[PDB]
Amino acid sequence: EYHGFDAHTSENIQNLARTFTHDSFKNDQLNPDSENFNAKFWVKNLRKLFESDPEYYKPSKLGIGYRNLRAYGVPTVTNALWKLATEGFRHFQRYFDILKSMDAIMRPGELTVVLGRPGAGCSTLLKTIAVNTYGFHIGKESQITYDGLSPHDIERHYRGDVIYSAETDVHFPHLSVGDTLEFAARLRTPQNRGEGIDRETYAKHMASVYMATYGLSHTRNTNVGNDFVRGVSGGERKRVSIAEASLSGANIQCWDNATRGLDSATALEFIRALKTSAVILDTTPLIAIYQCSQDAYDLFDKVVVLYEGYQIFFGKATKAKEYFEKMGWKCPQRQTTADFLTSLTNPAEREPLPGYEDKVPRTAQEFETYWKNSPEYAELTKEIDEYFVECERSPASPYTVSFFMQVRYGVARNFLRMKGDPSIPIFSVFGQLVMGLILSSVFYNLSQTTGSFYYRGAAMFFAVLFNAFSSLLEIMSLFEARPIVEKHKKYALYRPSADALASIISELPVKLAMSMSFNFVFYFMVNFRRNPGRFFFYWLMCIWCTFVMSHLFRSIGAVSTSISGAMTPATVLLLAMVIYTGFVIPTPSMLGWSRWINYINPVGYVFESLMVNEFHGREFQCAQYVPSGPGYENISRSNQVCTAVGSVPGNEMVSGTNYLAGAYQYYNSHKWRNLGITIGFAVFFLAIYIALTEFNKGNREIFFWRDLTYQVKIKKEDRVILDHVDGWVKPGQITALMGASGAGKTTLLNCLSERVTTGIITDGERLVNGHALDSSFQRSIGYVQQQDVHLETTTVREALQFSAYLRQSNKISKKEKDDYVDYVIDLLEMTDYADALVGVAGEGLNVEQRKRLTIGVELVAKPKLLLFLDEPTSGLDSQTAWSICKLMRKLADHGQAILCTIHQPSALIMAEFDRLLFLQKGGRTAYFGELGENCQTMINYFEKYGADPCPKEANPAEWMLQVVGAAPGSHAKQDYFEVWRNSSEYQAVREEINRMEAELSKLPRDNDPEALLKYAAPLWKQYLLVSWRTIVQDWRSPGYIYSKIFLVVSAALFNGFSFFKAKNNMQGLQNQMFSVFMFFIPFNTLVQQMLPYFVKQRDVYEVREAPSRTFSWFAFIAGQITSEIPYQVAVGTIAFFCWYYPLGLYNNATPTDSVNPRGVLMWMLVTAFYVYTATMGQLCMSFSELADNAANLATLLFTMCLNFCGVLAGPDVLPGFWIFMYRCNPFTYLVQAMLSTGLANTFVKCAEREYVSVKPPNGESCSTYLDPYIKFAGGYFETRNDGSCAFCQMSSTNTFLKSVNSLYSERWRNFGIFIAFIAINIILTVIFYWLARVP
Template structure:
C-alpha cells in the first residue's frame, strides 16, 4: 500500500501471513541457506528430501529445517537419508551450488545493470528529501525536524504527567506536608516587628533545611530517568526522535508541577515563620528556591544519563547531595573551609542559593541582642557600653546587631552578591541542561538478544555456549523418570484424580457496578490428557485458569470445582503446578540452583534433600537443560534466552511434583515455531506419562494444535463456544464447526485459525451468529455435560489417597524456609558486584569527603560546632544508601508476589527477614570503611571509651536502623520512585526534628514534646556528637572572643570574675583594663550542652536506637502484611470513594449484575 520495502522477522507466522510476503530468506547458525521467492522456498527444501506435513505452515516448515540434525522433527524421504544436509555448512554449500542461487545472482546482476548504484542513490535521496520535514537536514536519520520532535515529545510528556497521577500526587503532597511541618516547626521565630539574635541561628537553619529538602527530593529524578530510559532509547533506534529532544521537553512538561510544588513550599515556609515581611523579599525567596530546584533536578538527570545502572547513579547522586550541602556555607562557614575545598565552593549551586537567601533575609535587619555579656546578678546596673552581644557581627557597647554584619561575620555572605548569585545559578541550570542534552545523545541501546549464556566459574561446557540446548525427553524416558521403571501406565492413570468444574461464574466489581468475566463454564481435565484453553484476547482464558487454580483474590466465584466429584481437598494448591506467562526468576542464581531451591521448599518435608536433588537432575535431563544447568538465569541480553527461561519456568513447577494438575498460561508466547514445538512436545510427553495438563494457548499452528486432546473455546464475555475432543487431524472438532458455520476447513488450513474465524474472533473475521447460544443448544454440549455428570456419578467411589503432608500451606518448615532463603539471598548479594560496589563507593567517598572537610580539627569554638555539623552530614549518607536498597530489593519483592507467593513456596516474612539480614551485614562492612575515612582524618579522640563507642554505635547498630527503616518504606510503597520520594520526606523530617537546625528550646511546644523525642536521629546525634567532643578543651580563636570594655577602674578579671564563675569560660587578658577578651566556654561538652547533648546519656541513646530497630522490623512486617498480603489501602479503609456520590445521568437505569451499560460489551444480559 505504501510502496515500501519491509524486512520482517516474525514468530509462528500463520500461512495467511506467510503468503503475504514476496521473498523469504532462511538462516542456519548465521549462514544463509536460501533467499528467493517465498512461494518457492518450501519446494526448494522438499527437493532436498525433507517432508512437509500436510497442515504444517510454510514458516514452521522452514524453521524446522534449521533444527540440529540429531534433534530434527521433520521426516526424510526414503532414499534421501544420506543426501540431506546435516549441518549449517552443508546447507550453505548446497545453496551456493543450487540453481536457485545462480538465478539469484543473475537477477542481482540484471538489477544492477538496469539500476546503477548512482541512479539508485539519487532516487533514494530524492525520495528521502520528499518525506523530510521542512528545515530538516538532508543527511538526518529523522523525518521530523528537531524542534517538532521537541514539540511532539512535549505533548506526550503532558499526557504522561496526566496519566501518572499517583506520582504527581505523592510529589505535591510531599511538598505540602513538608512545607506545613517546616513552617510550624519554625513558627514565629521572632515577633513580627522585632527580630532577635536568638532567632538568627534558627533562620539560617530554616533556609539550610529548605535547600536540603529541595536537593534530596530531586534525587527522585534518578529513578524516573531509569524508568523511562528503555522506552526512550528504543524509540531512538526507530529514528523517531533525538533523545535530547526528550530531555528538552522535560523542562517544559515538568515545570508546572515543580513550579506549583515550590509555590506551596515557599508560602508555608516563609510566612509561617514570619520571615522578612515584604513582598519583594518573598518573591526573591521563591525565585531563588525555584531556580535552585531546577538546577538540582538537571544535575541528577545528568548523573542518571552518565551512569549505566540505578544503584551506581544513586551512589553518585548521594555523594553529590552530601558534597553540595557540606560546602554550601552553613555547616562549614566559607572562611573556615580548607583551601582544597574552596574550588568546589565555586561550583556549588547551593552555595549561591544559600548566600542569596541569607543575605536577602538579613539585609537591613536590626536584631535585638538576646544575650548581652556579662549579665545576671551583679550586672543589672552595668551600662550597655560595658557589654557586648554574644552573636557574630556584634559591636561592643551596642544591644542591636546588624543582619548584614551577622551574615558577613558568620558566613562571609554579602547582600550585594544576591542577584549575582542568582544569575550564576541560572547559568549553572542552563549548563546542566546542555550537559544532559549532549550526553543523552550518546546513550546506547540496551543489550538484547538473550542468547549470551553466562556460566559459573569452572562450569563452562566444552562446546561453549553454542548448541547448549539438548533434546527433550521422549515419552518412554519421561514415563520412567516420573513414574519409575516398569510401571503400568494404565494403572497409574487410572489411580490419578480427575478435576472437574461446572456452572462456573466469576463476577468482579467494576466502575460502581459489576462485570461478569466467566459465564456458566464447565469442563474437566483427565490424567494423561492435554486440554487446550483458547479464545480471542479478552475472552477470559487466563481468568478461567486463575479461577481454577484458586489464584483470584477479588470478586465472587460461584459454581462447582471438584476433585473426584468431591469438594476441593486441602491439598489442592500443593497438588497443582502453575506456569505463568511471565518468566520471573532470580537473575543471580544458576538454573540448577533455581530448581533446587524450588524442590526443597515445595516437595514434602519428609522427602530427603538428596532425593530432591536427584529429582532435580531428572527434570534437567527431561527438559534438555543439562548443558546449561550451571548457567546463570541472568537478565535480557546476558542470560537464558526465551525458550530456556520458559523451560526453567516449567521445571520449577515440575520439581514440586504436582500430583493432580499442571496449569500453563500461554507457554509458547514469544517463541519461534521450533521453540514452541519443543515446549509442546515436552508437554505431550508429560501428558503421556499420566500428567493432567490444562494450557491456554493463543492461535497455535496446526502441528501444535493437534498435539492437544481436548479444546475449551471461549468467546468474549467468558461464554463457552466448544468443549470436547479435538480428534485425529482435528476431525471431531471440525465436524461441529463445519456443521454450524456451513464453511468447510481447507485441507491445508490451520484448524485453530479456522475456528476462531468461525466465531468472529479473528483479526478480520465477523459473525452474526451467537456461538454461545449455538453451543448451548448443540448435541455436543449435551454430550459434554453428560460426560461431566457421568464423572460426578462414578468418581465418588474412587478411593481418595490424600497425603496429609500436602494439606499444609507450606511444604517446608519455617526454619527450612529461612535456611534456603539465607543461601539464596547470600548468592543474590555476592553475585551483584554492581550493587555492592555502589554501596562501598557511596560510604567511602562520602565519608572521605566529610572527613577531609573537617581534617585536623583544632580546639576552637567553631571546631565544636563543626563536629556537631559533621555528624549531621554523616547521616545524609544513609539517604542514598536507602535509595540504593530500594532499587536492589524491588525485584525480589516482585518475584515473590508474581510467582512464589501464589505457589506457597515460602512465607513472605522469611523473604523480608533474610533480605534485611544481608542488607545489614553488607552495610556494616560499608560503615566500617565509612568510620575509618571519617573519624581519623579529623583527629578525634582515640580513647576506647569514645572511639570504641562511636565505632560500636555507628558501624554495628546504625546500619540495622536505616536498613530496617528503608525496607519498610519499600514494602509499603507501590514502586521505587514513590519509595524514594517517601524516604526523602521521612528522612528529612527526622533531620529536622533532631535538634540541630532548630534548638530544642526554640521548637514550638507541640513539636518539642512529640517529634523531638520521637525522631530517632535525636538520639543518634546525641550519641555520636558526645563521643567527638567529650573532654576536649576550647581555645577560642581571635574572631570568637567576646571583646568588651570594663567599667572605669576595674580590670577584666575583677569585672568578669562573677560571670565566669557562674557561666564558665575563661579570660585571656585578666589584667587588662580595656578590651577584655572573654571566651564563653572551656570544654566542648559545654558547647553542645545547649543542644541537650550529654556524655552520660550515651548508653540511654544506645537503648533508644535498639527500640527503633525493633519497631522498624515489626512495622516492616506489618506494612507488608497490610499493603501487600491483605492489599489494603488507606483510601479503601476510610471508604473515601463513597464520600463523594457518583454522578448519575437521569436517564440511566440502576446497574446490577444482570444489566449492561450500552458501551460495555462484556456485561451479561439476563
Template sequence: MHNSKKNCRTKMPNFLNNMRSEHLLTLGYLKFSEGEMMVGAERALFMDEISTGLDSSTTYQIVKSLGLITNILGGTTVISLLQPAPETYNLFDDIILLSDGHIVYQGPREHVLEFFELMGFKCPDRKGVADFLQEVTSRKDQPQYWARNDRRYQYVPVKEFARAFQAFHVGQSLSAELSRPFDRSQCHPASLTTKPYGASKMELLRACVEREWLLMKRNMFVYRFRAFQLLVMTTIVMTLFLRTNMHHGKVNDGIVFMGALFFALVAHMFNGFSELAMATIKLPVFFKQRDYLFFPAWAYAIPTWILKIPISCVEVSITVFLGYYVIGFDPDVGRLFKQYLLLLLVNQMAAAMFRFIAALGRTMVVANTLASFALFVMLVLSGFVLSHHDVKKWWIWGYWVSPLQYAMSAIAVNEFLGQKWQRVLQGSNNILGIDVLKSRGMFTEAKWYWIGVGALLGYVVLFNILFTFALSYLKPLGKSQQILSEDALKEKHASITGETPVGSVSAAAGNINNSRSRRNSAAPGDSGRKGMVLPFAPLAVAFNNMRYSVDMPAEMKAQGVDEDRLLLLKGVSGSFKPGVLTALMGVSGAGKTTLMDVLAGRKTGGYIEGDISISGYPKKQETFARISGYCEQNDIHSPNVTVYESLVYSAWLRLPSDVESETRKMFIEQVMELVELNTLRDALVGLPGVNGLSTEQRKRLTIAVELVANPSIIFMDEPTSGLDARAAAIVMRTVRNTVDTGRTVVCTIHQPSIDIFEAFDELFLMKRGGEEIYVGPLGHQSCDLIQYFEGIEHVSKIKPGYNPATWMLEVTSQAQEDILGVSFAEVYKNSDLYQRNQSVIRDISRAPAGSKDLYFPTQYSQSSVTQCTACLWKQHLSYWRNPQYTVVRFFFSLVVALMFGTIFWQLGGKTSRTQDLFNAMGSMYAAVLFMGISYASSVQPVVAVERTVFYRERAAGMYSALPYAFGQVVVELPYVLVQSLAYGVIVYAMIGFQWDTKKFCWYLYFMYFTLLYFTYYGMLAVGLTPSYNIASIVSSFFYGVWNLFSGFVISQPTMPVWWRWYSWVCPVSWTLYGLVASQFGDLTEPLQDTGEPINVFLKNFFGFRHDFLGVVAIVTAAFAIFFAVAFGLSIKVLNFQKR
C-alpha cells in the same frame, strides 16, 4: 534469536532489535507501533517479532493488512516472526532464512522448498513450512527430514547450505542483481529528500511543545503530588520555625533562621529529584524517535525546560508566600520577592541538573548514582554544613563550582542584611546580621545576592544546554546479553562448521507426538516414566457453572452501562483428567488465563461463583496449593541463583518433611532429566530479556520448579509464548513428558503449529466474552474437532494441510457468528458433546467409594524453622552473586568515606570554637543522611524484584510471609557490618576524631545501626507501596522530614513544644545525638568564642548529654528492629498483586 529465524519481506532485508518485553506486547500496542511508523513518508518498514502474545488469527489479520498497505503504497516491509502459521507464512512474497549468522536462503517463497529438496531434505505433508525451515538447519532436528534413499544421511552444516544457495538459481539471480550498479537515470531527481526532517524547525518545535504539554497534563498527578509534598513540608516548617518562637536578639537566634533558609534550599533540591525519574523513563522513546529523525534534540529539550517554569513558579509560591511571614523573616516586601526569585532559580537549576544527569546516565541505576554524588558534594560544600574557611585547598574548587553555595550565600545576605538584623550587640562592632553570617563563615556583602542570582541563572542555562548536547550526541546504553555456556558455544560452532560437538547429549526437538504415540501404544501395566522416586496420587478436576465478575469500570459506567459488575466468565463447565493434556484456547480476550487463575485459586480480587471439585471433594485452596503447580507466563524466578539451586529450594520447601534429603536429591535429578535441564544445572537464571537463561530455557525451568513439588495437577499459562517454533517444540516435549507421568496438565496456548496443537489430547475452546464453544477430544489429526465444527451448518470446510488450530479460530470468530447468525456457545450447549461432558463432570464430582478427602496436618510442608533456613539460604546466594548491589554498595561506601575524609580532613580534633563543633557535627549529619538515603534507595529495587518472586512462591504454598522477611532482613546484617566497618575506620582516621577505644566503638556502633535501619526502612517502603517508583517518591518525603528534625537544621531545644515530640521519634536525631555525645559529650574544655565548656554548650544548644548515651544506643538499635518487624508485617498483610 534462537538457532534460526525467518524474515519475510518484499524487497530488502533488515532487522529491528529494539523490542519491548514480550509480556507487555499487546494488540493495541502493536497497532500503535505500526501506525507510528506508517503515518510518515517512509516506504520501508521493519518489524520484529510482532506476533508474540497474539493468537494465530489476529497475527494473520495484521500481516494481511500490512501486505495490502505494502502493495498499495509500493513500499518495502520486512517482518521477523517466531511461529508463523502456514496461512500467515503464505502471505509473504520473499523469505530470508537465517541460521547461526548465515543467510541460508533469500528469495521468493515459492522456491524455498525446491532449494532444500535439492539439498536432500523434504518438508512432511502435515508440517508447517515455517517450522520445517527453522528445524532443517539444526543438527538435532535435521535427520528426520532427510528424503534421499540413494545416499546415506550426513549432517549438512550451515556453511554448506549457504554455499549451495549461491549456486542455486535464486542465489545466482540475487548475485547478478546486486552486481549491477543502480541506474540513477531511471529515478526522478526529487525522489530522495535532502532534508533530515519532514517539517520546518518551527513546526517541529510546535509539535514537541504540544506533546510535552499533553504529557504534563496527563502526568499532572506527579506535579500535584510534588506540590502537596511541598505544602505539607511548608506547613511543618512554618509551625516548626514559628515567628512567636523565633527571636532576633543574638547570634544563636540567627543560626536558627539560617537553618530554615538552608532547609528551603534543600527542599527544592530534593523536590527536583523527581525530574530524574521522569526524564529517564522518557529516554527510550526519545532515542527511538531521534534516531528515526522525528525531530532534533533541541526541539525536545526546549519544551521540557520552558513548560516546566510555571510548575516551578507554583511550587516556589507555596514555600515562600505561605511561610515567609509566618516564620518571621525580614518584613521588607522587596526581600520577600528577592527570596522568591532566588528559590525559583534554585528550583529551575535543580530540575535542569537532574534532567542533564538523566541524559548522561541513561538508566535509572547510573543516573541515581551520579545524582546522589552530585547532590552530596553540593550539600556538603554549600557553606552551611562546612564553613568555606574550613574547606581544604584540594576541595576549594568544589566550593566555588557548587550552585548551592551561591544560593546559600545569596539567600543568607538577603535575610541577614535586612532591618530586623540591624541591631549591634554589646562588644561587637558589626550589626547582628553580619555577626550571624561571620559565625558560619558566610560572605557579608550585599553584592553576593546578585552574584548568586547571576550564577544560578548561568547554571540553569548551562545545565539545559548540556542536557541538549547529551540528547544530541549520546547513544542508549547497550543491553546485557545472554551468556552462552561452553557446551552451547561448541554446539553453535559445530552447527556452522559441521564438526561433531564433543560430549553432546542433547536430544532433538523431534516430533512432539512421538512420546504421545509411545504412550498410547504402551501396555496398560507399563508405567513408563511413572516410575519416579516419589509417588503421587493422580487427581481430576471438575468445575461446573463457573462465573467470574469484577466491579464495573468507571469508564464503562460513564458510557451509560447500568450494571454494577462486569461478567468475565459466563457459567463455564468442564473437567481435566490425569494423564490427559488439555489445551485451553480462544481468541485474545476470551478469558483463558482468567479461567485458569480462578481454578488455580490465584485471583486476588473479583467475585467467583460456581463449583470446583478435586476427585469428588470440594476444592479447598489451603490443601489444593499443596498438590497443584502453576507455571506462570512471565517465568518469575530469583535471578541470582542457579537452575539446580532453584529446584533444590522449591523441593526443600514443597516436598513433605518426611522425605529424606537423599531421596529429594534423586527426585530433583529425575525432574532435571525429564525437562532436559542437566546441561544447565550450574547456569544462573538471570533476568528475562537481560541475561542468564534464554526464554525457552526459562520456560523449562518454570515447569521443573513446579514438578519438583511432585504435584498431581499442573496449570501452565502460555508455555510457548515468545518462542520460535523449535524452542516451542522442545518445551512442548517437556510438557508431554510431564503428562506421561500420569499428571493432570492444562495449558493455555495462543498460536500453536500443527505439531504442537496435535500434541494435546483434549481441547477447551472459549469465545470472546468468557463462554466455552467446544470441550472434548481432538482425535487423530484433529479429526474429532474438525468433524464437530464441520457438522455445524454453513461452517466452511478445512483446506488440506491447513492448521486446524487456525481454522477453528477463524470459523468461530465473532465475525463468522454474525455472518452465519448462530451462537457457537448455544450450539455447544445444545449438543450431545455437552451432555456427555456434563455426565463426566458429575462422575468426577462424586467421590469414589473408599476414597478420602485431601488432608494435611500443617498448612505448609515444612516447619517455620526450616522455612527460615531455606529463605535465608536462597537470600545468601542471591546477595553473594549480586555484585551490582553488594560490591557496588561497598565500593560506594569506600568512595564516600574517602570523600568525607578529604573534605573534613582532621577537623574532628578541633574543638576550640563553636564553628569547629558545627563542622564536626556537619560531617556526621551529611554522612548519616547521604549514606543512609543511598542504602535505603539501593535496597528498594532488590526487594521489589524479590517481592515479585515472593508472590509466586507464597501462592504456591512454599512458606509464610514471615520466614521470607526473616531471610531478607538477616542477610543484610553481615554486609552492612562489613561496609560500616570499612567506612567507619577510614572516616574516623581521616577526620581525626579522638583515638579512644570507647569513642571509636561508639562511632562504629551508631553508624552500623544507622545504616541498618535505613536499609530496613527502604525494605518497609517497598512493602507498604505497590511499586518501587511509588516507594521512592514516598521515601523522599520522609527523608526530608528526617532531615528537618535531625537536630542539625534546628536543634531540639529550639523546637516549639508541639513539635519537640517528633524529634524523639525521628531516627536520624537519635543517631546524631549518639555520634556527637559519644565524641564530645564528655569534654569540659571551654570554647574560645563563648567561654562555655563543650559539654555544657552541647547540652544547652543541642540538648545532648553524655550520661544519656546508653538510652540513645538502645533506641537507635530499636529503630532497626522496628523497621525490620514492620517490613515483615507489611509483606504478610499487604498484597499488591492484582489478578
C-alpha cells in the same frame, strides 16, 4: 476491525478530502466533488504534490540491491574488580562469521519476509539492511546500493529514509493517538513557500488521512498507553507505530518479531497494514517472523530463507514451496508453507521424499551449494547485475524544519504531555509549598535581637537548599522521554539538542510556580528584612540558584541511565556542595585543602550574596551582656559588652556588617559579583548539558469432576462462566483444553486447581478416586504458569534444589532430594547448562530454556495427582513449541497426567495429544473425547452431526473453531452445546464417570499424616532458606553492594576529612554538630538503591511462590528483613571507621581515660543508624506497590524527622504544636547520644576572633571584676596588656552539650530508646505486609 483499505476506507478518505478542500476554498481523478476519483491516487499524490518541492534531492521510493554480502563478529562482586581490571586491559590493547555470501534485490512496493529459526541471522540481516551495523562489521567485497546511493550516504545525508524498530513499541503513554500522529505530521511538513496552503490544516489532513488508511480512526483522542498504562488495544499500538513511521517519510522499513506475543487474528491485521503501506505509499517493508499462518503468508511477495546464517532461497513466495519440493523433501499434509520452510532447517524434522533420500542436502553447506548451482541463482544474479548497471548509469541536514520550530514543537508536545498527566507538576508544587510551611514553622518570627543571629544563618542555609533541590524530580522526566527521543532521532525528525532545549523551556512555568509558592511564604513567615527591594533581590538570587541546580541535575542525568545509577555518584558531589555552602563550615574554619572547593562551588556564592544582603547595614539590639547576674545588678553599660562575634565593648547595638566580616568573612562588595558568577555557572552548565545530550548518546490416583458450574458476580449481576462442564484425566494421557477467547478455558483451569479468588461453585463436585477433596489437594498438583518468573541470579541447579528442599516431604533426606534434582535435570535434557545463571530474559537462558526450567521446578516437587500447564506453547516459535510438545509427550510416557490449555495451535502439535475438551462461548462444552490420529475422531464426530466436511489441507483447530462459530466472519448452523448434550456419547461420558466413581471409591486410601499439612517444611527451615537465598542474591547482584560501599565510604570520608582534627572553639562545636547532622544524608540514596531488590523478591514470591504454597508470608517478610542486616552492619562499621577517627573525636576521651567505652558506643550507634535506615526503607515499602512511591515517602518522613531533630531548634524555641514531633522523633535520641559520646568532658579554647573585650571598672583587676561571673557561669579570661580582659564564654564542652539538651550521663538510655524504635519498625513491617498484600 481492519481489512486493508476497503470501500469504506476509500469513502472516508473521500469525505476527508472534500472537507479539506472546502476549508481551503475559503484533474478529473483528483477533484473530490467529481466522480471517477479514488482515494489511492489522492493519498499517493498528497505527499508529493500539494506542497512546494525543495530543489534538493529527496527520494520518494528506495529499492535495495545487494550482492556478496557478509557480516562477521568477534559474576560475584568479589571478582568484579578483577573482571574490571581485565576489561581495562582489553581496552588498553578471532572473527566469527554470522552472515555468509548472499544475493538479493528488493524493489519498492513489495513486502519481503525473512524466515529462519531463532539465532539463524535474520535479525542481523535486517540490521544490515537498515544500516545499523553497530556491534559488528561488513566485508569489503560486499556491494550494497540503495537505488544508486551508498550505505555511507544513507547513514549521513538521507538518514530517516531507512528505519528499524524491532519489538519495543515505544510511545508516550499519556499522549493521544491523534496528537502522536499530528506531531510527526507537522514535524515533517516542508516550509519552502507556504503561500496558498495553511501548514496546520495540511498537517491535520495528513494525520487524518493516514489514520484512516491504517484503520485508526476510531482510536482518535485515545491514550496510546503502554503495556502497563491502559489505552488502545495491544494490536493497535503496532498499527500506530506503522502509521507514525510511514508518516515520517520512511521508505525502507525493517521489523523483526514485531508480531511476537500477538495472536494470529492480529498478526494478520499487522501484516495487512504493512501490505497496504507497501501497495499504496510504495514503501519497501521487510519483516522477520517465526509463527506465520497460511493466510498471512499469502500476502507476501518475496521470501528469504536462512539456515545457520546461510541464505538458501530467495524469490517469489509462491515458488518457494515448488522449489523445495523439487529439492526432494516432503511437506506433510495440513502444514503451512511458512512452517514447512522453517522446519526444513531442523535435522529432526524434514523427512525426505521416497526415493530422494540418497541425494538431498543435509547441512547448510550443501543447501547453499545447490542454491548457487540452481538456475534461480543465475536469474537472480542477472537481475541484480542489470539493476546495478541501471543505478550506476543514472541535503546537508537530514531534518526538514529548522531548529527554532523543532524547539517550538517540542515545547508544544511537552505542554500536551503535562496537561495529559498533571501529577508531577501539581504534586511537586504542593509538596514544596507544604514543606516550606512546615520548615518555616520552626523559624517562625525570628527576633531582632542578636540572639537570633544563628537561627537567621540556618534560616538562609536551608532556604538555599530548598531552592537548590526544588527541581530534582524533573530529571525523572528525562528518563521517561529518553527512548522516544532516540527513536525520533533515528527517524530524522529533530535533534536531541532541540528536545533538551524544549524540555528546559517547558519546565519554566513549574519552576516559577514552585519558587513563588515557596519563597513568598518562607521569606515572610520568617521575619527577614522587610524592605521590598531586599525581598526582590533575595528572590532573584534564589531563582538563579535553582536555575544552576536544575541545569547541573540535567547534565548529570544526560549521561546516566537510572535514578539510582545517577544518585550513587551524584550524592557525593551534592554533599560536597552542601557542606561547603558557607554555614556548616564558615570560611574562617575551613581547612587548607578544602579552601579551593569553595571557589568552584556554585552554591557558596548564592549563600554569601543572601547573607550580605540581609545582615549588612543593620543594627541588632543586644540580648546578653557578658557580665551579669546576682553579683552585678547596677553596673555601667560601659563595662559590659555583647556576646557576638563583631560586638564592640560598651555598645548597646551590634553592627551586622562587623558580625559578617568577623564570623563568615563576607563583605558587601561581593553582593552583586556573586550574581554574575552564578549566572556564568548557569550558562556553563546549560552548555555542558546541551553538548552531552547531543553527543554522549547511543500417579495412581485419577482426578475427575462432575457437573461443575461456576459463576462470578460483576456489576451486582450473577453470570455463569462455566455451565456443567464434566471431564477427567488419567495417567499417561494428555488432555488438551481449548476454547474461544471468551470461552474461559483459563477460568476452568484455574477453578480446577483452586487458584481463583473470586466466584463460587454452584452444582459441581470434584473427586479424586471417588473421594471429596481434602486439604492436601493443593500440594498434590503441579501448576506450570505461562509466564516464567525466576530470580535473575540463582542458577538452574540452585533454583531446582531450593524448590526440592522447600516442597518435598520433610521425611526425605537431603541426599534423595539431590538425587531427584539430578534425575529431573537429566530427564529434561538440561545437563548442558545446569549451572548457568538464569539472568534477565535478554541475556541468559532463552525462551525454551526458561520454559524447561519452569517445568522442572514444578516437577521436582513430586506432584502425585496432576500437572496443569497454562499455555505452554504460546509465545514460542514453531520449533520451540514442537520441542516443548515432545517434552510433554515424554513426561506423559513416563507415567504422568497432564491437562494443558493450548491457544492457536498447528496441526503437527495438535496431533500429539490424546484427549480434547472444547469449550464454546460461555463455558459450554462442545466436544470431549479422544481426537484419534490426525484429529480424525473429532472431524468425524463434527461431520456426522450436520457439519461441513473439513478441507484436506485445512488446519483442524481453525476449522473446529469456525464450525462452532467463534472464528470471526463465521456462521454456525446451530449451537453445538445442545447437540452435545444429547449425542449418544455424552451418555457414554456419564456412564464412564459413574463407573469410575462407583469402582475407585473401593480402592484403599494412602493416609499419610504428613501430607495433610499446609506447608511441607517447618517455619524455621523456610525462614533460614529464604534469608540465605536473598543474601546470596544480593551478593551476586551486578554491582549493588559495590555501589552501596562506594557511596557510604565516599560520604563518610568526605565528612570526616572536611572537619579533619577539628578544634574545640565555640564555632568548632557547632561545626561538629552539623557534621553529625550531615552524616545522615545518605539515607535517601541507600533507600533508593535498596528498594528495587525488594521489589524483585516480592514479585517473584507473590506471582508464583505464594499460590504454590512454598513458604508462608511471614517467612518471606522475615527473610527480607534479616537479609539486609549483615550488609548494613558491615557498611556501618566501615562508615564509623572512616568518619569517627579522621574527625579526631577520640582525643576528647583522653583526659577522662574513657577511650574504649566512648568508641564502642559510637560504633554501636552508627551501626544502629544504618540498620534503622534499612528497616525504615523496608517498612515504607511494605504496603506501597511502586518503588518510587515508597522511596519518596521514606525520604519525606526522614526529612520531617531531621527538621525537628533538635539541632535546628531546641524544644524551647520550637513552637508548642511541634513539641510532640520532637519527642516521638527517632533521630533526636541518636543525635544526643552521638554528641554526648563524642564531645563530652573536654576543654574549650576560644578562637582569636571569638574573644569578647571587656573594660573593667577603674581601680580594678580582671580577676577581681569577673570572678563572681566565672563562678556563676563557665568561661575564662586573659589579660591583653591594654587594661582590658579577653573573655571566652565556655570553658568546658559540657556547657554547649547542655545547651543542645544532650547529656553525657544519659547517653546509654538514649541509645536504648533508638534500638526500641528499630524494633518497632520491624514489628510494623511484619504487620503491614499482612494487612496490605497477604490475601
